[PDB]
Amino acid sequence: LKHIISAYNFSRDELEDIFALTDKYSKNLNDTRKILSGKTISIAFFEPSTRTYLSFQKAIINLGGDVIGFSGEGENLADTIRMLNNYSDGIVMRHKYDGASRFASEISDIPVINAGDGKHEHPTQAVIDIYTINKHFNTIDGLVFALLGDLKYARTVNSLLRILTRFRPKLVYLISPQLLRARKEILDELNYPVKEVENPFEVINEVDVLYVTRIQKERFVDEMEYEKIKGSYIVSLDLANKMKKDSIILHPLPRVNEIDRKVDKTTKAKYFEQASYGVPVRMSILTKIYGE
Amino acid sequence: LKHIISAYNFSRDELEDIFALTDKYSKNLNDTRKILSGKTISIAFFEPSTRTYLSFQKAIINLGGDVIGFSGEGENLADTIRMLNNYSDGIVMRHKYDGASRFASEISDIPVINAGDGKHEHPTQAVIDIYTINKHFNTIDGLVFALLGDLKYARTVNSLLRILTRFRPKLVYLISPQLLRARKEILDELNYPVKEVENPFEVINEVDVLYVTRIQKERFVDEMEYEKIKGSYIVSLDLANKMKKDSIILHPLPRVNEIDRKVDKTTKAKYFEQASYGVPVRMSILTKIYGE
Amino acid sequence: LKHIISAYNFSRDELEDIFALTDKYSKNLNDTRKILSGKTISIAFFEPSTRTYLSFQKAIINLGGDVIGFSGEGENLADTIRMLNNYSDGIVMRHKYDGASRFASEISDIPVINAGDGKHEHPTQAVIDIYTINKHFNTIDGLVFALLGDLKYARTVNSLLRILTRFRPKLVYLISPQLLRARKEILDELNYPVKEVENPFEVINEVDVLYVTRIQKERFVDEMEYEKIKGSYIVSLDLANKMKKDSIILHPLPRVNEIDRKVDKTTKAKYFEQASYGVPVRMSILTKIYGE
Amino acid sequence: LKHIISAYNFSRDELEDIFALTDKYSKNLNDTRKILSGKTISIAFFEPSTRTYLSFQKAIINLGGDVIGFSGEGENLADTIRMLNNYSDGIVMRHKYDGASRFASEISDIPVINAGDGKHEHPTQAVIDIYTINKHFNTIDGLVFALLGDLKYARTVNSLLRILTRFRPKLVYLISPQLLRARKEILDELNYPVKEVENPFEVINEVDVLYVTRIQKERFVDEMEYEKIKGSYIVSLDLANKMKKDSIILHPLPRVNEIDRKVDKTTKAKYFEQASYGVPVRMSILTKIYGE
Amino acid sequence: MVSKIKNGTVIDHIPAGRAFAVLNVLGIKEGFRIALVINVDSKKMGKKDIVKIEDKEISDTEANLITLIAPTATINIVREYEVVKKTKLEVPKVVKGILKCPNPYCITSNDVEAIPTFKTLTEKPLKMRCEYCETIIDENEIMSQILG
Amino acid sequence: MVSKIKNGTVIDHIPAGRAFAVLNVLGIKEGFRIALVINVDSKKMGKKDIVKIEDKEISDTEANLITLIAPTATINIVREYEVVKKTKLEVPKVVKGILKCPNPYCITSNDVEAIPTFKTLTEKPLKMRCEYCETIIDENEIMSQILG
Ligand SMILES: [Zn+2]
Ligand SMILES: [Zn+2]
Asked: Which residues bind L-aspartate (chains A, B, C, D)?
């Protein structure tokens, strides 16, 4: 590992390794090896996200690195990448344009970690999601997944569907309105079975993992088609109760109201734990790039 | 050295010293003396610039200092300076009002480093430019310079023309449209020869150093006078080819389109290296203030 | 006739009458009977349109009426209607909310003429369109129509499909992208045959009347689906040449670029003449309300 | 006369005629011949001006015409011109684009009167200015003029310099800052002597007519060059007192502060009378187009 | 370097590199045959381009537009392999379409139906003027609108 | 309809009208001589264009780009009047520069240094994919980017 731009940058072997390092770092001992000691990572979030900025910041600090960075704001991505190369030993970037990280990674000598590019990918988030799943079931092979909500414009879904190709899912249910369906291009990449469906109550009873993404108003024919459809891609307390005893509900946070807040008190709610592995998982990805 | 508000704060002797320290710090060893250990520098960029913020930040960290700062945003400059004096051991500031740093430096007990005030000066940038020039030619005396573009409202030109008075340039060509000419006040300060000219192809063949500044639309009679003139103060690949074998092209970055991007592949392009000395040069200026 | 809120307010008999009066008023003699002499019509265009404001204004003046009105700009529609009832003898209104005219007409004692409500209707525009068609072919029964572009959110299409039910069209082709299809509710009202189709070159050769509406970007999944589709719902010079010798192209103006401007020089272009009947047609509708 | 787009549309003979009709209409009898009776003029002020809108409106009403119009606010100028041709018998338009009226006049069958296009012309204003001058001195030939203020971007100056070519001025002083000088193109059209000058006190003693235009801040190198220069292109009470006994001061209103308000009490102030001839002069231009 | 033409127009002596610009200036880019050679030897010019348009005899009006970028060019009209007219190029009085007005506030720079029109003011050093807004353009602006 | 070439490349059998687009696709538009004929008779195609580039032997890489708009074209390399290679055109694997990405949010549609790159996904009905954003384009989008 060097550039982390796509979920395809990871092999199954690299992922099993990152999981083991995440176990170790989780068990938050005061002797973690400071593999980034004397190194500066720059966090270049052209498109802001405080949750994710702070999460990489804390990983980098836990490993002994110094952090520089910016958040927001006619200078070329290439010129900025060049400058960060004078100033730092690696870059974590978040950008509004698809492919931005790919392109930075080709300009750049130091590693570049994609923390979100446009609607294309967010690979570290996918690593966090599968880490949470494998932690719960001691496996990823054999599981039955359902992705619920917007599956067309969500980079986390794109990264999760791609990373799952390093594993053997039994089946991935794609549950969305007709409008928010996974694009053809992305479905032709996959090497595991998938089935499109409009209502989650049809198959909720079968699914090991339910992964939800927000539907946004700002994305519809008119406000009336959104108001008619919005209601049935929420994770309600009733949809939670119809899931199997051992199943989990996942969501890459923040949330607004796509999850009934009463759900956070059930044992199936796992999105809180999911956000909590973010730091050790990113420490591990960083350890695989700089410390091996 | 204490306050760095004008390029006139430097003597020829202090500059030769800063160059030697820059050589040493460039050769980026892992034993740099942490002269700012236990010290906090505040970076007070009332007028933002990420490139320059990060550059002083990294210098200060390379020397063992802690950084605090802000960027942007009815509180008096004097009250802010007072507060930074409770919180820190020196201040690097960037402001929209001419003379701001001068004034801070008189309110303040800790050192104040001007990283840009209005259209007046940016002295550390001038130190970086002459460092790059002296590195290339083993001298500044005897060279033939040409400054190209806006020479009226560019604080980097003002700081470069003033710092060059500690040296003996053969000649400084001032190449601008009539509108963007160096002000009378600044030309009467200089102690070396200068000649005003409208087209660079008249004398390009003679010049050791070509230093370019952007012309901005937002500065003209009408958009038509700008569109008529803009074209011939760009550094084109053809203007580059008509320069001598040993000459260099300089620009205090960022750029938009005042330099043809094909130029970045010629050996005469030196603006990339120029931005890359920013950190060691500022480490050196900091070492002259705090570590001697 | 009294309130004109829907195209359904007109019978086939009233329409044949309006056509005859339009012939007479067109032939623009200097002896037109001033049926609105001593009357004030208020033009209440809560949602502005200068083209249509001026058109009713001129009709009202040609008939000897005085005009008052406003254009644009927390006061209730009902209170405004009440006030216009103190001030005037009839109201022509344009509003952003569907059903607005219907509602005004129930509050109001003087007549109310809908000149556009939301995305619901514009009945006088439909009367102008069929007047133009009947003028050209000496009939509306038996014709083969094609409506091209946005058929979901265009109030002129809604009013034209409804008014055509007072006649016997051979067939109405509905040609739109999947997204911009006529709503189910409106299709179940119709009493004549209709067929949905995605490309106009499939049936252009058959159609007596081609009526086009703009597709707007601001109405799509993303800008890429719009850029992919936009091109083939333009009336191009080539689509014009494949139409029959006697056919006409209609568009309720203004246009932006949904009609190639070279088309305006062919004999099939009839949108200019169509806008030119606006005034006599509205004079006639006004004569049927006030002068009979 | 038909289209009035440039001051060049008028001959010396047509102008002497308009003056005589203006005398007659001024002497505001209650028997003015209603040459626009039964006619509708549309006032199409794409770029608003209430003073001028109302002035043409009142002229048109004094002559028995009906007025329609709009003020302000992607529809083509050509389509609007076409529509006004259905609705009206002539057009008075004001537009932000140079040449707009010229272009309308070529699309249009009814007359088109330019009431301001961009920075190019305002011919009716020039007719009003020379009417005022000829009224005062019983002549235009032989006078010594001075134009003061902005002479580059003022369409009234452009129209006045062009209309004066139908006459024999002794001399036209052009008094402006260097920046606001009459363009070369316009000076090469003139057939009478002209002399450029920076300060009005040099020649004020010689001038029959002083015509002033505002200098705007929004037009300068920086706010400091404007603040340095602004003061000496005002008509001060002192500059008024140094003019000859019989001379006049003219300004096409509105004013802000380019004329000391104490001047409005001297006998040389003629800008109030100048605005007051606007209506009869425009009645006369209208009478030459429609009533002869 | 190209074959003889039965009927049409031969435009010889175009500056090397400017044949594509001559076609644009004539509105050509369908039906009829065209041939070009670019950068061939010319005894008087060093290098040159040549354009041949079968079956079209270029008018004097269209041909005078060619002077805006190829003032040395020569135009021959050909019938049955024989040259029947060597046209004398003049500077055009008016130019609609080919040239834009550099004033962004000119009606021609904003309304599609408002086609740019320049009237020649002097032939000599060539200056032309916009008929809508009076903006002046010189040989240099002319040539870089067309050779781009 | 044009003379024989001593050294270089002959591109025959281009669809009528597309020679200018073949030159663009090769980056050509200075030094060397070029000749074209447009709309001449072809026994198999009806009509056709022909391009001849003196002194340049086109590579297989540059030549495979020609298939994007002229898949029937044939390429001959010529030395001393003799054809020394008839090149076998294939569909290119990668296309940098010639084709833009229709996604306005792709880094290649926004950063000048970020040069558009498409990798061919299927040859068969031709689909190509953006390497930055995975947007797919078909023969129709391909051809109307280049023939405009
Ligand atoms: Zn113009
Ligand atoms: Zn792309």
From this structure: 155, 214
Tell me, in Å, the resolution of the deposited structure.
2.6
Give the dihedral of Cα atoms C147, C150, C153, C156; nearest 10 deg: -40
Residues B264 and B235 sit within 8 Å (Cβ to Cβ): no
Length of chain A: 292
Strand arrangement, sheet containing B194-197: B194-197, B171-175, B144-149, B209-213, B248-250
Number of domains in chain D: 2
- Give the C-alpha separation, B64 to B87, whole Å: 17
Angle CA A24–A27–A30, to nearest 5:
95
Instruction: State whether residue B120 is helix, strand or coil.
Output: coil
Which protein residues have a CB closer than 5 Å to ligand 2 (ion)?
Answer: F 101, 103, 106, 130, 132-133, 135
What region does D64 belong to: left with phi over 0, alpha with psi -120 to 50, or beta? left
- Give residue A63's domain range: 1-122+271-292
Strand A248-250's sheet: what is its strand order? A194-197, A171-175, A144-149, A209-213, A248-250
Decide: helix, strand or coil at residue A237.
helix
For tokens 């402001």, the residue is B95
Structure tokens at B190: 């200089």
| Cα–Cα distance for residue pair F77/F57, rounded to 1 Å | 6
- Here the tokens at position C80 are 């405004």
Rounded to whole angstroms, the Cα distance separating E144 from E122 reads: 19
Question: What SS3 string covers F105-140?
Answer: CEHHHCCCCCCCEEEEEECCCCEEEECCCCCEEEHH
Q: At which residue do the structure tokens 């109550």 appear?
A: A201
Which fold is adopted by the domain F1-91? Alpha-Beta Plaits (3.30.70)
Give me the amino acid identity at B285. Answer: I
The answer for residues whose C-beta is within 8 angstroms of residue F37's C-beta and 6 or more apart is E2, E33, E34, E35, F1, F2, F49, F50
Q: Cis peptide leading into A254, omega within 30 of 0?
A: yes
The angle that helices A50-62 and A278-290 make with each other, rounded to 10 degrees, is 50
* Experimental method, per PDB record: X-ray
CA distance D225 to chain E (A): 26
How far is residue E141's CA from residue D285's CA, in Å, rounded to a whole number?
40
Domain ranges of chain E: 1-91, 92-148
How far is the C-alpha of B57 from the C-alpha of D226, rounded, in Å?
40
Q: Dump the DSSP string for D195-215.
A: EEES-GGGTGGG-SEEEEE--
- Are F1-91 and F92-148 in the same CATH fold? no
| The residue to which tokens 């080539």 are assigned | C238
DSSP-based three-state secondary structure for E83: strand
Chains B and C touch (3+ CB pairs under 8 A): no
Contact predicate A27/A21, CB 8 Å:
no
Same-domain status, D263 and D281: no
Residues C82 and C152 in one domain: no
Select from E107, E109, E133 the Cβ nearest to the Cβ of D77. E107
Q: Which of B178, B184, B218, B221 to mutate to test the interface with D (most CBs of D within 10 A)?
A: B221
Q: What is the three-class DSSP state of F58?
A: coil
List the single best residue of A221, A222, A223 to mutate versus C (max C Cβ within 10 A). A221
Structure tokens at A239: 């949809």
